[PDB]
């Protein structure tokens, strides 16, 4: 019961899925062939890891996942790679021609040809669930598949599944690793189309992850490999609540209840601690109080924005490892008396806490040090709207001169879809301003 299907869309979405699934296997004791000696219930069970892994009669633990890209080259590496025996061929879906960093191609042109095949395979996975909770969608904002195909898939999933949970891990564009000049158009187009069709979305600023790798892990020019290894850790922290069981374990839905005050205000800020190198972690252990305080450090955020210049609407602390309530309670009490967190006048100032005892695992040949305890904070701050504004400014500069718009118009889109998307973004920015005003 309570199964979750993961959907990995485009290169960003697929490569992050590779990292995530690689890490879940390591955390549950699942071998690259899908075998799990730790599991005595052969052919199936009701265990907490079963929300993410299906079981075959043979004893193979199969990810409840679909990988989609409009081109073969990225998924082909999964088919050939270490975990080729982990997935059934039918879970790995490729086209022949990609969306060429164009929303219109992924949503319409190219995407229309593969959509029903993707839905069939999602349906096949859905049919093996005794009690489907919902979906986890991994994609980039900037790519044509990542933006347009995700939009189309989201719309179709709302039609096919109703109001069954749809969560996203969206890669926010950064110049340092940016592939296209039209990423701000694709980001605004996907955000508009998907807004109504998502219940919660975790944005990951590639610049924020880039900076952490450079600063905390002392990596000169971070690769997507380095980036995905750090995202793997944040994703694992948010899904640990679902993949493990415990007395102090609070479900992702309970965090969501607190994180979403209004349907459109469903973008939580993720902050992870500790991100430390093996060299810097040798003979230095960080306490519950140390890792907790590090969450209120803008340097550890998944999105670059200032929550100290914004207002909180929630704080959730998701602990991993050697953590006891006494210490968490004391660390929270300290931050509170330290009065560093300004909250909206309309909501309770409590901190919702979950704890899983299984400590964070590390991928061999990693930059990350294995720590005894880790924390992920999910906060709903008005500061996340800074990300919306930066992306909205870039869009504005280009759309004023109608720069590159013909590439979209030539694929069947109208100028009207652009202006309508942008007006939704102005409305969302206004909504984030409104929630931050004190009541009269």
């Amino acid at each position: 019961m309570r199964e979750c299907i993961s959907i990995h869309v485009g290169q960003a979405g697929v490569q992050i899925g590779n990292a995530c699934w690689e890490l879940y296997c390591l955390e549950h004791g699942i071998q690259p062939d899908g075998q799990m000696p730790s599991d005595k219930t052969i052919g199936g069970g009701d265990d907490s890891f079963n929300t993410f892994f299906s079981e075959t009669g043979a004893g193979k633990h199969v990810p409840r996942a679909v990988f989609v890209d409009l081109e073969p080259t990225v998924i082909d590496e999964v088919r050939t790679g270490t975990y080729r025996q982990l997935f059934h061929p039918e879970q790995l879906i490729t086209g022949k021609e990609d969306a060429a960093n164009n929303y219109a191609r992924g949503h319409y042109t190219i995407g229309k040809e593969i959509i029903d095949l993707v839905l069939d395979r999602i349906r096949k996975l859905a049919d093996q669930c005794t009690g489907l909770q919902g979906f986890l969608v991994f994609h980039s904002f900037g790519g044509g598949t990542g933006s347009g195909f995700t939009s189309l898939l989201m719309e179709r999933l709302s039609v096919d599944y109703g109001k069954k949970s749809k969560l996203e891990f969206s890669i926010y564009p950064a110049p340092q690793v940016s592939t296209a000049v039209v990423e701000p158009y694709n980001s605004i187009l996907t955000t508009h189309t998907t807004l109504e069709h998502s219940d919660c979305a975790f944005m990951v600023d590639n610049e924020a992850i880039y900076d952490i790798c450079r600063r905390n892990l002392d990596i000169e020019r971070p690769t997507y490999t380095n980036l995905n290894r750090l995202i793997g850790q944040i994703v694992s922290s948010i899904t640990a609540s679902l993949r493990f069981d415990g007395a102090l374990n609070v479900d992702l839905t309970e965090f969501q209840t607190n994180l979403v005050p209004y349907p459109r205000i469903h973008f939580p800020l993720a902050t992870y601690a500790p991100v430390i190198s093996a060299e810097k972690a040798y003979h230095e252990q960080l306490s519950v109080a140390e890792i907790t305080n590090a969450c209120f450090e803008p340097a550890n955020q998944m999105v670059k924005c200032d929550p100290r210049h914004g207002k909180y609407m929630a704080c959730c602390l998701l602990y991993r490892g050697d953590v006891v309530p006494k210490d968490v309670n004391a660390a929270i009490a300290t931050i509170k008396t330290k009065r560093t967190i300004q909250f909206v006048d309309w909501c309770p100032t409590g901190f919702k806490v979950g704890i899983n005892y299984q400590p964070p695992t590390v991928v061999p040949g990693g930059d990350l040090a294995k720590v005894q305890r880790a924390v992920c904070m999910l906060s709903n701050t008005t500061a996340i709207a800074e990300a919306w504004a930066r992306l909205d400014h870039k869009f504005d500069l280009m759309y004023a001169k109608r720069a590159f718009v013909h590439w979209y118009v030539g694929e069947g889109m109208e100028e009207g879809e652009f202006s309508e998307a942008r007006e939704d973004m102005a409305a969302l920015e206004k909504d984030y301003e409104e929630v931050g005003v004190d009541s009269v």
């Binding site: 060429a100 592939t179 280009m398 004023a400």
Partner: protein
């Protein structure tokens, strides 16, 4: 995935022949058609430009066209003339005689369908065709008229494919031919409407680089073609080797073409070399933004950059490349359009070209390209006001109307490159 190469006329076939030698060398393919290389990366994306023939052989997906067998015979006789498919040499006996109307409407027209059949044979056996690339001249008659006739005939059968061209621009410093401005203006009028992306290879630039910079006493056509080949190898690197940025014709087009008509790129290369026997990341970075390294006789500082692509070849620090690319952008911010944020894209290939340890190719969509078109419109108006040499063209069937129309369209294109050079952010 697959690109179809088409070389038309003397200039086209000559520059196209060198392209095939150079990239074959790079991919480890000998003139027989076998792979005798070291790295696996040479083969990863070989299917882009080559056909995997029976008996582990690699055949250039190239179509050689000419209204006269002269040049094509020399190419067949050449060092690599044996790697080609014999059936892909499609040639006339008449010639165009540096007449656009002959290559376009009459002689080239009678030969065009025989070409289309080979173009189709190549396109049918493609797993997923990207588009096509044409090497030619605009000053001649065959590459100029037939090359532009082929562009429109192919577009009718593959409207959704990328049309890329390496258009060699006519200079008086290079040829005595008086009808070169007439042939170019009628060609550019075709290119504005029917190509997705055109690399503007100005002969004036190639000659001045040879004479002045390269210190060549008497520059030959093969000396000019060493610059063309270097340029052609750099601009296609990202298409031939595994990478992330501008890896296909359309991803490159989406990044470089903000407006449909403004698709004429100013290629640039560093280090500038000669086929004789003879640079740091900041030096490479600096050089490929200076007029002396421009393959089109245009000064970047006389216009603004709409978009730029920077290809880095060799083993260097990615961190350093990132820092140097950031340096030139901050230090030259005025020369970049503000209303197009993050318009400079940078790729890094570990495979350097032969004879170098590191190189930098620059692909720019600068409004300064209007200098190349203004020069051709001046060279045209000198003759057209006089109604000079028009019998060569009217005689083949054309009207005076066509030349007025072609002049206007190329004048409009310059008004447009200026329009966005003057365009404000606030």
């Amino acid at each position: 995935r697959e690109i179809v190469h088409i070389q038309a006329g003397q200039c086209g076939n000559q520059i196209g022949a060198k392209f095939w030698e150079v990239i074959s060398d790079e991919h480890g393919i000998d003139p027989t058609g076998s792979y005798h290389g070291d790295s696996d990366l040479q083969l990863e994306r070989i299917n882009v430009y080559y056909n995997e023939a029976t008996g582990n052989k690699y055949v250039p997906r190239a179509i050689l066209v000419d209204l006269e067998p002269g040049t094509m015979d020399s190419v067949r006789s050449g060092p690599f003339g044996q790697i080609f498919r014999p059936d892909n040499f499609v040639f006339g006996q008449s010639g165009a005689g540096n007449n656009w109307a002959k290559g376009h409407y009459t002689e080239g027209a009678e030969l065009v369908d025989s070409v289309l059949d080979v173009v189709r044979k190549e396109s049918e056996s493609c797993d997923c065709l990207q588009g096509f690339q044409l090497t030619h001249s605009l000053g001649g008659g065959t590459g100029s008229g037939m090359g532009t006739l082929l562009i429109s005939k192919i577009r009718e059968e593959y409207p959704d494919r990328i049309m890329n061209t390496f258009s060699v621009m006519p200079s008086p410093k290079v040829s005595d031919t008086v009808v070169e401005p007439y042939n170019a203006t009628l060609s550019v009028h075709q290119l504005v409407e029917n190509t997705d992306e055109t690399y503007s290879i100005d002969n004036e630039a190639l000659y001045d680089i040879c004479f002045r910079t390269l210190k060549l006493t008497t520059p030959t056509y093969g000396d000019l073609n060493h610059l063309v080949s270097a340029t052609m190898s750099g601009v296609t690197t990202c298409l031939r080797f595994p990478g992330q940025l501008n890896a296909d014709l359309r991803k490159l087009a989406v990044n470089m073409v903000p407006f449909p008509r403004l698709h004429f790129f100013m290629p640039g290369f560093a280090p500038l070399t000669s086929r004789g026997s003879q640079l740091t990341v900041p030096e490479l970075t600096q050089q490929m933004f200076d007029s002396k390294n421009m393959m089109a006789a245009c000064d970047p500082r006389h216009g603004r950059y709409l978009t730029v692509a920077a290809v880095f070849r060799g083993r260097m620090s990615m961190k350093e490349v990132d820092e140097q690319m950031l340096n030139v952008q901050n230090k030259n911010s005025s020369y970049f359009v503000e209303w197009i944020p993050n318009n400079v894209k940078t790729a890094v290939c570990d495979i350097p070209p032969r004879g170098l340890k590191m190189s930098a190719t620059f692909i720019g969509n600068s409004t300064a390209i209007q200098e190349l078109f203004k020069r051709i419109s001046e060279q045209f108006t000198a003759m057209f006001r006089r109604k000079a040499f028009l019998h060569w063209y009217t005689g083949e069937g054309m009207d005076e109307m066509e030349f007025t129309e072609a002049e206007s369209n190329m004048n409009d294109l310059v008004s447009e490159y200026q329009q966005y050079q003057d365009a404000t952010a606030d």
